[PDB]
Amino acid sequence: VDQRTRDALQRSVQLAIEITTNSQEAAAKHEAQRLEQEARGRLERQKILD
């Protein structure tokens, strides 16, 4: 009934989108590290074969 209560719920929406945005960047960071380590481990091996 009161706009002061709708404003409180409108902040909860923004925080839910920021939670989803952070979850996306954290997932990209984990795959970047996985691929970086997968390249690095093959390069370290190739140096020993060379």
CB 35, min distance to another protein, A: 17
What tokens does 11 get? 């902040």
Report the interface residues with another protein, using CB under 8 A. Answer: 41, 44-45, 48-49
CB 9, min distance to another protein, A: 52
Whole-number Å distance between alpha carbons of 28 and 33:
9
Q: After which residues does the chain show a gap where C to N exceeds 2.5 Å?
A: none
Instruction: Choose between 18 and 38: whose C-beta lies nearer to another protein.
Output: 38
CB 47, min distance to another protein, A: 9
